[PDB]
Design a protein around this ligand. Structure first.
Ligand SMILES: [Mg+2]
Ligand SMILES: [Mg+2]
Ligand SMILES: [Mg+2]
Ligand SMILES: [Mg+2]
Ligand SMILES: [Mg+2]
Ligand SMILES: [Mg+2]
Ligand SMILES: [Mg+2]
Ligand SMILES: [Mg+2]
Ligand SMILES: [Mg+2]
Ligand SMILES: [Mg+2]
Ligand SMILES: [Mg+2]
Ligand SMILES: [Mg+2]
Ligand SMILES: [Mg+2]
Ligand SMILES: [Mg+2]
Ligand SMILES: [Mg+2]
Lengths: 55, 88, 218, 100, 51, 129
RNA sequence: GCUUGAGUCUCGUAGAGGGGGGUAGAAUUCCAGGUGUAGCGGUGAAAUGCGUAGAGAUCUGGAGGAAUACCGGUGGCGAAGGCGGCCCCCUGGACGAAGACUGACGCUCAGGUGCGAAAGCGUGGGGAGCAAACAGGAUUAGAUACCCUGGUAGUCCACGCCGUAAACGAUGUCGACUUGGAGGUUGUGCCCUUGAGGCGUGGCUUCCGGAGCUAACGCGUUAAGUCGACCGCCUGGGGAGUA
């Protein structure tokens, strides 16, 4: 959310597969769903999080 | 988009005091300043059409202002175009 | 000045803009009417009501909703006044001459309920013709005897009485109505602000109308 | 002078280069009179997916305030140095401390 | 996707696959490209989900 | 734009009136007033007021008679695009005689009736009825 | 002269706004290899095609181009065209809170200039998938098609052309005025912040609906309502956007 390093908070905004969870489920606000995804994206690149559950 | 440092500078170089921000000359001057800076931005790139639109915008504005001045104080006009270095 | 123990106002969003001048509400996402404006409208309400009621009151207490209906089959019903307390058969004012025969049937039937033919025919026909009666009975009570043309009309909830008011508006029948915050006024010549569907504002002004038609010239 | 996160991650085998690397970057940035507001040698962390063959690799966090210029001549060195399997330099918006 | 199911049973129980992929992003990516036409598909897919 | 302000006045009446609006205000001007004057003197507006000083504020009270408004129609005539100037023999009389025509003259904003008597003419600002 | 129109200045906010450089994982195709063995592929059914020089399937490594799942949404930006992975660099616009400066410096704009999807053209380059042309197999009375197997240009990059689209809201721009309701989005002021809020106050937007307007459909404070300033354009169908 407020940051990608927080993989802690994060891991509960992604499905098992690692797909970013729709806001209609997280029930999250708008502005933040973006800050969220952006930080998730950010965290996948630094291998702090999977893209895929195939690993 | 021009440095608060640099924009201020020019306000204190063309107006009564700083704060005299809206003084004709001052506008005409910090437009000029950007217009010129920018000419290198668009020196590279050139395909940055969109940004170019603001730059054209800049020119046509400063142009209108320059015009109005000449209409009012033709003195402050000549002084300005000399000292801003344009109108050839 | 108030009397209304509790009709205060009523009705929340659904407000009809034109009902501004009779509202000062705001409590908990619903507006309270102008408590002190409903009142100077009993001045004129019951006044030109009783005013025509002495010169001879023939009213028509039009009001419906399976939860307020029968509470009009009273001193509203009884005294110098007539009533409709069910689905307002459209055109019953406007087709009065068609429906006029829907009366002849009602009578020519009950006038033959405990009268005339009855316990004869089949033990089918029986309540298998009082299914006819019970029907025409409600919706077409206050019609029965008309005697003196419908002359003003007292109507309960202006918009929920879309038709009957409109009918009147057409026929020159002054329409006295109470109009919630949500209901559309101006169809009403004599407009009565305030709640329209709480068991009180009804009986109150309702019974209070009966209580001024009922007496005006001794 | 602007800020950046920066969080290059190095190759296990070249682990004991990480101290010299940090010494070096700090030197370079400090020399430009730019400060340095956080530093975290997370060491050998386990990878989510197995980037570049090899799982688990040595992370290092930074947080610096330096002129868009030395930050420029950083990703270069970050490229040159095939011991750094990824890097990333980020936003800014004023300094930072602890978290993580 | 994955179920490493455990001790005493034999039933499939894989109701998971109708929770993401399968004919989800699969009947999708299968065929006609689309392009600007999804826009039209997903525009009618909101006009519906209003009421 | 703001280029014709009198049509803006004419319309703020026209509109608010059809909105059954009690008052209505607008930036004032010498001109504006002299007209509202006539509107009042001839009984179309209830009463005006200019509550300002640096940023003047012409303000008018609309009347409603029966259920209607008193202004059954208020159109501009002259306008910055096309200015109208009728002599005197040519001055236009609205609704036969009822209703008025606001006309500016070498001596002030008067009504066609008035101007006709005055013996002069000028720019026929607008029509009212 | 004036300060309300219009600009300038200060701090900030949101953003697939533009241009440039990096870079990431998922897949497809291809190359190499391990294992494995008689089919695979495809359709409505088939056949062309592919496989015992071992295909498909399965695992492993590698090369290459192209596009960026999930976020994602009557969500967001732009003058229109249009713009979706991540990061840095350069840069345009918008909006908001304050207050300060300019002092009508404005609106519109024939001519003019710029921009302007996709296709198409010029030179080099690049080429995985898709695919005009073209080949082959089918269907069919016929099949120069729709379906199948292949597949060239093109689709990709750089520079330069072309200047058109149902380039559409089929609604020119600017300004003023005129009842409502439920959202979405994005600033900001105030309240024991003591509720994840509570009451306001701008920008933008979706649905619905009043007067009114309309041939009707419908529009409806984002007008197709009430008005003004300017500009483009229409005058029966065909002929013709042709000579
Ligand atoms: Mg004037
Ligand atoms: Mg791959
Ligand atoms: Mg492979
Ligand atoms: Mg910007
Ligand atoms: Mg071009
Ligand atoms: Mg092209
Ligand atoms: Mg080419
Ligand atoms: Mg084909
Ligand atoms: Mg054309
Ligand atoms: Mg459209
Ligand atoms: Mg257009
Ligand atoms: Mg609304
Ligand atoms: Mg609508
Ligand atoms: Mg209009
Ligand atoms: Mg031609």
């Amino acid at each position: 959310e407020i940051d990608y390093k927080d993989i802690a908070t994060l891991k509960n905004y992604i499905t098992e597969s690692g797909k970013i969870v729709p806001s209609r489920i997280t029930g999250t606000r708008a502005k933040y769903q973006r800050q969220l995804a952006r930080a998730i994206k950010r965290a996948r690149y630094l291998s702090l999080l999977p893209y895929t559950d195939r690993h | 988009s021009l440095s608060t440092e640099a924009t201020a500078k020019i306000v204190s170089e063309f107006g009564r005091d700083a704060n005299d921000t809206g003084s004709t000359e001052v506008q005409v001057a910090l437009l000029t300043a950007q217009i010129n800076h920018l000419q290198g931005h668009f020196a590279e790139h050139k395909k940055d059409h969109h940004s170019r639109r603001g730059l054209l915008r800049m020119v046509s504005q400063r142009r209108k202002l320059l015009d109005y001045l000449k209409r009012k104080d033709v003195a402050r006009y000549t002084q300005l175009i000399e000292r801003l270095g344009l109108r050839r | 000045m108030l009397k209304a123990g509790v009709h205060f106002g009523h009705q929340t969003r659904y407000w009809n803009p034109k009902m501004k001048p009779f509202i000062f509400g705001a409590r908990n996402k619903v507006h309270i009417i102008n408590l002190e404006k409903t009142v100077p409208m009993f001045n004129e309400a019951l006044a030109e009501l009783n005013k025509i009621a002495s010169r001879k009151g023939k009213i028509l207490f039009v009001g419906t909703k399976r939860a307020a209906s029968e509470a009009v089959k009273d001193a509203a019903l009884s005294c110098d006044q007539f009533f409709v307390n069910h689905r307002w058969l459209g055109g019953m004012l406007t087709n009065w001459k068609t429906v006029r025969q829907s009366i002849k049937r009602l009578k020519d039937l009950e006038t033959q309920s405990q009268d005339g033919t009855f316990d004869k025919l089949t033990k089918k026909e029986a309540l298998m013709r009082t299914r006819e009666l019970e029907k025409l009975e409600n919706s077409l009570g206050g019609i029965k005897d008309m005697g003196g043309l419908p002359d003003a009309l007292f109507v309960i909830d202006a918009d929920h009485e879309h038709i009957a008011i409109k009918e009147a508006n057409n026929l020159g029948i002054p329409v006295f109505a109470i109009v919630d915050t949500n209901s559309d006024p101006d169809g009403v010549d004599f407009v009565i602000p305030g709640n329209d569907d709480a068991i009180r504002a009804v009986t109150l002004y309702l019974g209070a109308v009966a209580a001024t038609v009922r007496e005006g010239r001794s | 002078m602007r800020h950046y996160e920066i969080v290059f991650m190095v190759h296990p085998d070249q682990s004991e280069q990480v101290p010299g690397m940090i010494e070096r970057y700090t030197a370079a940035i400090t020399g430009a009179e730019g400060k340095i507001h956080r530093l975290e040698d997370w060491g050998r962390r386990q990878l989510a997916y197995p980037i570049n063959k090899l799982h688990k690799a040595h992370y290092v966090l930074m947080n610096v305030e330096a002129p868009q210029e030395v930050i420029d001549e950083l990703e270069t060195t970050f490229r040159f140095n095939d011991a750094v399997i990824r890097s990333m330099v980020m936003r800014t918006k004023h300094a930072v401390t602890e978290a993580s | 996707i994955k179920v490493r199911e455990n001790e005493p049973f034999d039933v499939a129980l894989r109701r998971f696959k109708r929770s993401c992929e399968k004919a989800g992003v699969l009947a999708e990516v299968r065929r006609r490209e689309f392009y600007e036409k999804p826009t039209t598909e997903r525009k009618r897919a909101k006009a519906s989900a209003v009421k | 734009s703001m280029q014709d302000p009198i049509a803006d006045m004419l319309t703020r009446i026209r509109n608010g009136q059809a909105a059954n609006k009690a008052a209505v205000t607008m930036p004032s001007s010498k001109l504006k007033v002299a007209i509202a004057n006539v509107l009042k003197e001839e009984g179309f507006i209830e009463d005006f007021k200019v509550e300002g000083d640096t940023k003047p504020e012409l303000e008018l009270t609309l009347k409603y008679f029966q259920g209607k408004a008193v202004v059954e129609s208020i159109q501009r005539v002259s306008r910055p695009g096309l200015r109208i100037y009728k002599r005197k023999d040519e001055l236009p009389k609205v609704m036969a005689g009822l209703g008025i025509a606001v006309v500016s003259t070498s001596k002030g904003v008067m009504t066609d009736r008035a101007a006709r008597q005055a013996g002069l003419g000028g720019e026929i600002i607008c029509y009212v009825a």
